[PDB]
Amino acid sequence: PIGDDEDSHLGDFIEDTTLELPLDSATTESLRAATHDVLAGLTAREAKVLRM
Amino acid sequence: GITKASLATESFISAASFQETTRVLTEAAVAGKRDELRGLKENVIVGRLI
Amino acid sequence: YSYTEKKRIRKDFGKRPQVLDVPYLLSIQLDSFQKFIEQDPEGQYGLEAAFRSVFPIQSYSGNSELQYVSYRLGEPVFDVQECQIRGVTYSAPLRVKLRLVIYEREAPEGTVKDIKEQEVYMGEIPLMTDNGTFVINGTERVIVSQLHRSPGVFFDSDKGKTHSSGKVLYNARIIPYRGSWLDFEFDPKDNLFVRIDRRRKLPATIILRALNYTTEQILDLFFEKVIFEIRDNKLQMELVPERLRGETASFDIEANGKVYVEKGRRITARHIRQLEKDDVKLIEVPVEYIAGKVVAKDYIDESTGELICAANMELSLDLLAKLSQSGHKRIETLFTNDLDHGPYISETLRVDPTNDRLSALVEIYRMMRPGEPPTREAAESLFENLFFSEDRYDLSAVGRMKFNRSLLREEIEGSGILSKDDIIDVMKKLIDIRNGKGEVDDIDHLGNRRIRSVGEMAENQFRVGLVRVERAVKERLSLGDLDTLMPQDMINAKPISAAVKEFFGSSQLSQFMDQNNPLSEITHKRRISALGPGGLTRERAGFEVRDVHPTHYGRVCPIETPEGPNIGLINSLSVYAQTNEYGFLETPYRKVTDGVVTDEIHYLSAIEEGNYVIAQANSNLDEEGHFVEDLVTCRSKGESSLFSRDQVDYMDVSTQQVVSVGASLIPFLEHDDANRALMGANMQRQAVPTLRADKPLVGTGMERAVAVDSGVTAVAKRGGVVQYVDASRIVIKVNEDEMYPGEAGIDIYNLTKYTRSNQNTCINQMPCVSLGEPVERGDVLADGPSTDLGELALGQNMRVAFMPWNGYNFEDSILVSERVVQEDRFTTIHIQELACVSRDTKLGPEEITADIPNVGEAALSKLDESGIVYIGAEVTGGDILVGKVTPKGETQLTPEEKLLRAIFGEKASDVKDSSLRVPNGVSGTVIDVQVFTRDGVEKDKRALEIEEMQLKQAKKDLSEELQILEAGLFSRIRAVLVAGGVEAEKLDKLPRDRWLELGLTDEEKQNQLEQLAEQYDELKHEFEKKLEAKRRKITQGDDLAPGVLKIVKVYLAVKRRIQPGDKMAGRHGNKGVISKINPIEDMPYDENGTPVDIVLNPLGVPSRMNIGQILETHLGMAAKGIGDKINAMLKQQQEVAKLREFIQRAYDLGADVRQKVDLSTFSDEEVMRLAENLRKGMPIATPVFDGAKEAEIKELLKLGDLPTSGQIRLYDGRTGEQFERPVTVGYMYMLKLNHLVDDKMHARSTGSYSLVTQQPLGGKAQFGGQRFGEMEVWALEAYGAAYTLQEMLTVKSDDVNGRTKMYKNIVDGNHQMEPGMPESFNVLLKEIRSLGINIELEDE
Amino acid sequence: VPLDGGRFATSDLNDLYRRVINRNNRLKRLLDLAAPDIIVRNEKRMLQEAVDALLDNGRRGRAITGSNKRPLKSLADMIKGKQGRFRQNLLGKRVDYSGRSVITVGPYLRLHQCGLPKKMALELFKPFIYGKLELRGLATTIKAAKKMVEREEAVVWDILDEVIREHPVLLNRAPTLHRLGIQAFEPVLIEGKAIQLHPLVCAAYNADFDGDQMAVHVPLTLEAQLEARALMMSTNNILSPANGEPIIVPSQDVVLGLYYMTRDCVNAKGEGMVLTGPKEAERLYRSGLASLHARVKVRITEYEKDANGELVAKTSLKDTTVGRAILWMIVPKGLPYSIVNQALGKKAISKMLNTCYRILGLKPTVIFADQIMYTGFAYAARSGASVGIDDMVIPEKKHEIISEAEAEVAEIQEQFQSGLVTAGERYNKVIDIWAAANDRVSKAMMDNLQTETVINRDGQEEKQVSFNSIYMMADSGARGSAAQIRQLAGMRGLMAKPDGSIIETPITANFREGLNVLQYFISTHGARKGLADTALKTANSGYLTRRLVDVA
Amino acid sequence: MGHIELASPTAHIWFLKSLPSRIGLLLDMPLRDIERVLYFESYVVIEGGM
Ligand SMILES: [Mg+2]
């Protein structure tokens, strides 16, 4: 227990550092969208090779 | 009474959410009791619509 | 008056001449810890008591014994300022001289083979500061005095509640100071019972059979013997006539010719007195009266030895015929009665199974350690070690005093352990209480309540450490060699220091000092808690402990306790109350003679109060001490009643002794309800120190005691002429008569500048005296926080109008003009301490370099070349104070991010910005930067810069110490050489070195020159060695946590002004939140044109019965009216005779008072500075229950030009037209409480989540989240809201996929939720499933 | 998991499974070595204890943890109780998109809207602002949107005003007992850091503004916005669920402004003149020719619902006051004039809102409650209703009645010293005569307050109800009643000792006079008993609510 | 999730120590005798013939 003996124990303060922030997920979504739109602008072989 | 008509219930999560928990889970574990979510306590518990 | 007393003298109402002034308000702490650490030559309380009690340690009969000599405490390594900077305990070592002896063969009295006597270290104990504060781990902590049950003997009733029979029980109890308890109690059918603990109910008399007692002498001690003699026939009865009281006989009792007692008649005491006068000893009864008696002792046949009857057996006619044939005519029976002498012990013997001593000890040893078979000698040693061993059982001197007092003994000293007479007398007293005589006690009574303090609790934890180490010393000395060791290898200083540091570091009684107000310090040191170890808890107790008992009068304040979970368990110690020798409370009273009240005072405790009858403080007496009536209100035994003129024993000292220091600074406290007075004195602690200090116009006269006798201001210890005034230091030249002959010098007072208090406010000292001013001894020189001229200025006084002003003051709200915030008269100063640690990870160490990945140069322009922010750069939220980067690796990049990296070639760096940043939404100035570095690590450039800064500061400061100190010393030398051999113009040309060695006549003057010379040389050498010591303290490394490289601490000083949302409060408990901060143009203004500053609400005043805020408002208007008249008479340049006349009329003004004044002051120089100090408003003292009434306020308002009714017509600022029904304006002293809004306000979009259950963890500034608890879920169920609840406890909170799906859908602008399943329900399934219980989800 | 500093936090289940695995390996190792029977029976008892401590610690000798005296936490400790998953993490969860700050008044609001700070509105509505900025192209990517709302550029405040406009937030006070504790509002942005909360709503919350702080939640999805508008907007809840009484009853300043506005003194400016309607009543009061309250014949036109939902108009000269005519502009069409022709205390204004709701439906009652609150605060400001020290008239008959009672207790004292009576009948007679003296003091002070104003018009004299400040604040029902007015002016009661017995010597001093030390010391016990009882009754009422909702 | 192969079997405390004891009134046997069997203080016959 941290002080004043409340229901506050040490377990309710430990943050999770293994998650990713949702803003990073928004960047990843927008980056996949932008890269798909840009690789659409290439030729067939160049886009196929660059995806492969 | 209200502390006894609430635990004598055909839905054990509403009988296990507030009062004596151990007796309710063992009484519903020896009985194989089936809970049909029946009435807003379980649906707040299980996180769906009310 | 003294010198600052005549600087701004406060007008004082009140009619009682104070005869005992207010004592030193911190005497509990300092006097207790003076009892703790002091070389006591005797067994007085202290460390000497603990050592002389637990020592000598002897071996396991191996003739090797360790005994005690003395102790000593070394001086601390670190002074208090460096100790608060570094983080260690402010402690002192504990050197102890111990002596080890070893004996020889077959000589227990003989000569030892050797003695070994040396000093040994046993732990550090913390020292108290000069103010009552300890420092444990960097912070400044206070140990609160504890209240508990006095050790002794308590006779409680516990009426009614057992089995609902209507019968009362009785239980006696022996409560030791250290050991096992003892209980005696009855049952619903009249059987006595013992308890050695709260363990199982045992029959009572077995403990008597545990003390080597047979049935004979048990019945002898608890009963009186009725003798049946057979005088030749008929089995007669010996008679004492008093034995027949209240009784009814079954036959005719006849004595000396006449039948006095008739058959079937109750016996009147007239019969008893006639039997006394008729010389009646032995009378004749039939054989039928012995049918109910019980035999006392064992009756047998002589020759055969067969048992006629054993002890405690009722007598039938068969037993009578058996005792007739053996020949015995002596019969001993037990005298019984239903009222006077109850046969309780006989019944308890008939319940008891055992007979002898051994089966009694077997029963106790089986009934304390159950399940194991007993053993004789183990049971003997057990019952030795329960109540009769000097080790495991102890009543102190207080225990033995109460144990003798409640048994009506004679001596008040004795052994700590019990004895047979003790337990038998307690059982006798319990049977006497059951038999109707005597009374029970009550635990609320403060004669049965002991107040512990810091010295006693530290002593007891020190004794815990000493027994924990003497186990190891008995283990070592049993295996002890002859000569291989000095006697320090036996003892470990880990448990002693561990125990005392565990007590001061972690307890419910040792807590952070509330340090945001001088009142808050001085009332946190004066606190009487009932919680903690050895005391009740909030869950278990209880209502009578919360309630106020009539013996709290003048000992414990009734109107100050924290309203909330623990009401009344956190009591506060009254103003005049002290602590008795035996630890109890005691309060001062004035001794009353025949009719004359003598000024001598007697401190009376609680159980000594009830015998006398005590007069009233609010009484009226002439100069001859006679009461003006013939009857006066008093209290005899908790009962207010009107008694005669000369039956009184003691008078109360003053009008103020019933309250605390927190409550007595509420003026007009006799005009408020106790609810709002409780809230007012509860919140008068929490004022933030404002930027100025502004002199409460309505004071109570207790302000100077709280100002001086706390620790914030700088009180002069020796008066003189002020030589030098700076903001840093004040340098006093001491007068000649107050100066010591040796160590001449002058005084220097280093003020504490802007620094951090524990509640983040800024404790500061500022000089209030000027250059070249006479000062008295004990006179204030430097005002602290919230202090003006040695008064207590918790807040500021403002013009108040009580009117509803367009609803902005709706419930309790306050509304403030812009004239307050433009003046910065509530702008407070906070200091925060941000910290940046730099550890060593297993991926690499962290750096404090200035180069940060992916930030702008404009974000780093506020940094130096070393990466730590400059002193004095105003930062906002988000600025970088300590540039710190942590090494990372193994990025694990994705698809098209890896594509992008390939396209643009930018290296994902091997490091991460984890810099220290300003918290979200503050501002302010970086005022102090510290760099703590582990020794053996490269110090960077700014660390060496701070070291050179502190080194030059310390060397310059100590050189100024030595220079100004020797300037005073050479100014004394010149005063010496003029008397007896003057060089008027010759001396100042020849150098200071050749003053110490100039010749002069052999007198006291040459000895004086030798003294001053050796003091000069000693201060030079002392300067040199302590400069080297200060340099080696600064330059060396610093202890840190295991595995942290360096810590950079940065102190921000925020300047927070005021805004809607703050809280303000007067001293009467009128809380309020500032709602709108209007411009000056919109305020109500009267016909002179002065805009009111705060418009309160009148509707709180009839409801909440605190009418005293109105009287304080009117008298504030009176005070500022006198101030405005003085300001007008000073602006017109009236001569000093006119000001003298007007101030004279202002200070006379009223009934018979206690405030004689000038003309004794100086012609101009004291009067004009007094008028300069009164132009802001003439203050008024109102001593608490005795002070200013209404008619004196009216007569003071008539001195001003103000209306008598106290209500001015006012004009609205907007419409410009008059308010109907003229309103109350005045000057209320109001306080800014530290519930500021910007500490309270936050919000969260999406932050962190808790680990074990994927929910946003609550707190600040952990970004929290307003907990939508169980009742709010019921509230949304109560509406038709169901989608709100579904997102409220799945998507916004718990679901690990759902929150990111929601965030994507929101930033795409598509409001839609994909609910899924909560995560914590999946945790619940894994927790029930990780039992033996199968729980599943089903098919469709 | 690692804390910062190389030191770990384990849960105590790791200790429990470590002990169980340890003793299981020990028992396998013992049965390998063919141990004697005492040792393996010891080990099977130990494994029983280890498993039974893992499943539910506390039904044995409470096996404590290492380097600590505190008992550890098993599985049933994590399911069962106040801190279990059923009551700490399933039935009530901590929620994102929430905020918390100190509340304050702001009387310039209609009751469908509350204040909300700009900084909280920027922190709560961050993903909405992100979405609108990447829609409007001011931020090319979303990281640019993060840095734009971080630097707080001047373009984001128009964006935030677009995302607020019709989006209800939920306001919540922490003791959320009945279902009016969570209500929706529409935010108006505030230069400040304190939530402005509409005044008429506060009686629903049991929220005074003495520092209590409230919490806002944000309906994210579209259905929750429509729920908070259709079901939980503040204009929907103007009736309690406990009874049909209005819960948006005007509370304290507004009822004082009304009770000052609709009253009549026998002589004022414009006494008994004639008025063509409410409009020149307002022109007479606001020019200062005629007073606010003077009895006056006016011409008013009242409508009624005589036919089937039809507004039949009738016009007449009512004999009323000026201020009643000024309030008549605020009454909607449907109500009769007799709703404003009386004095309008708190009960009367609750009946006014109740009749307006039961006749004209919801919309005129909402806009009528807002107009009542505005005119109440405005004419309370014009009232200048101010408490003062002369406002509490002490009866001249006070000390005379106290002296008579002091002689009567001396009579009963002589009758007890004469052995004529016992103790209990003495006690009962003394408490009856002190209660009789207290009742005489109450009937003295009420007649010395309420009719004390005596003035003249076209004749000698005439008495009326008083314009004392404290009498208006007690008669209007704003704050307090005659018990507290009694304790301010007459003697205060008969206090009870901690026995529950009641003292024969009552407190013969009010608060306008001083109280000496013994009287105040006796009063302190009643105050502290009151505080302790309020705390304990709060706890028991919470438990009663919880059992009642969980049975139903 | 994981598992532990317990070597000797072990009574489940929830079916042993809750007040309506299930092993208690399933075998129709008083609980102190059941704890006396489980703590190896006594014996109990297990269908030992007649
Ligand atoms: Mg409140």
From Swiss-Prot, chain A:
Effect of residue 44 to D: Disrupts the interaction with Escherichia phage lambda antitermination protein Q
Subcellular location: Cytoplasm
Domain notes: Contains 4 domains, connected by flexible linkers. In the active conformation, the domains are in an extended conformation, each making extensive interactions with the RNA polymerase catalytic core.
Summary of the function given for this chain in its UniProt record: Sigma factors are initiation factors that promote the attachment of RNA polymerase to specific initiation sites and are then released. This sigma factor is the primary sigma factor during exponential growth. Preferentially transcribes genes associated with fast growth, such as ribosomal operons, other protein-synthesis related genes, rRNA- and tRNA-encoding genes and prfB.
Family: Belongs to the sigma-70 factor family. RpoD/SigA subfamily.
Protein name: RNA polymerase sigma factor RpoD
Species: Escherichia coli (strain K12)
From-to range in the entire protein, with total length: 510 to 561 of 613
Curated annotation (Swiss-Prot), chain C:
InterPro entries, per database record: DNA-dir_RNA_pol_bsu_ext_1_sf, DNA-dir_RNA_pol_bsu_external_1, DNA-dir_RNA_pol_su2, DNA-dir_RNAP_su2_dom, DNA-dir_RNAP_su2_hyb_sf, RNA_pol_bsu_bac, RNA_pol_bsu_CS, RNA_pol_bsu_protrusion
Catalytic activity: RNA(n) + a ribonucleoside 5'-triphosphate = RNA(n+1) + diphosphate
SUPFAM superfamilies, per the entry: beta and beta-prime subunits of DNA dependent RNA-polymerase
Modified residues (N6-acetyllysine): 1020, 1198
GO biological process per UniProt: bacterial-type flagellum assembly; bacterial-type flagellum-dependent cell motility; cell motility; cellular response to cell envelope stress; DNA-templated transcription initiation; intracellular iron ion homeostasis; nitrate assimilation; regulation of DNA-templated transcription elongation
Biotechnology remark: Co-administration of salinamide and rifampicin or salinamide and myxopyronin suppresses the emergence of resistance to both antibiotics.
Keyword match Transferase: yes
Coiled coil: none
The name this protein goes by in its record: DNA-directed RNA polymerase subunit beta
Organism: Escherichia coli (strain K12)
Lineage: Bacteria, Pseudomonadati, Pseudomonadota, Gammaproteobacteria, Enterobacterales
Curated annotation (Swiss-Prot), chain D:
Superkingdom of origin organism: Bacteria
Mutagenesis or variant effect for residue 528 to C: Resistant to antibiotics salinamide A and B
Residues that hold Mg(2+) according to the record: 208, 210, 212
UniProt PTM comment: Acetylated on several lysine residues in the presence of glucose.
Subunit structure: The RNAP catalytic core consists of 2 alpha, 1 beta, 1 beta' and 1 omega subunit. When a sigma factor is associated with the core the holoenzyme is formed, which can initiate transcription. The rRNA transcription and antitermination complex (rrnTAC) consists of RNAP, NusA, NusB, NusE (rpsJ), NusG, SubB, ribosomal protein S4, DNA and precursor rRNA; S4 is more flexible than other subunits.
Family: Belongs to the RNA polymerase beta' chain family.
Protein name: DNA-directed RNA polymerase subunit beta'
Source species of the chain: Escherichia coli (strain K12)
Swiss-Prot record, chain E:
Recorded superkingdom: Bacteria
Biotech / industrial applications: Co-administration of salinamide and rifampicin or salinamide and myxopyronin suppresses the emergence of resistance to both antibiotics.
UniProt PTM: Acetylated on several lysine residues in the presence of glucose.
Subunit structure: The RNAP catalytic core consists of 2 alpha, 1 beta, 1 beta' and 1 omega subunit. When a sigma factor is associated with the core the holoenzyme is formed, which can initiate transcription. The rRNA transcription and antitermination complex (rrnTAC) consists of RNAP, NusA, NusB, NusE (rpsJ), NusG, SubB, ribosomal protein S4, DNA and precursor rRNA; S4 is more flexible than other subunits.
Family, as annotated: Belongs to the RNA polymerase beta' chain family.
Function: DNA-dependent RNA polymerase (RNAP) catalyzes the transcription of DNA into RNA using the four ribonucleoside triphosphates as substrates. Resistance to the antibiotics salinamide A, salinamide B, rifampicin, streptolydigin, CBR703, myxopyronin, and lipiarmycin can result from mutations in this protein.
Protein name, as recorded: DNA-directed RNA polymerase subunit beta'
Source organism of the structure: Escherichia coli (strain K12)
Full-sequence range covered: 102 to 151 of 1407
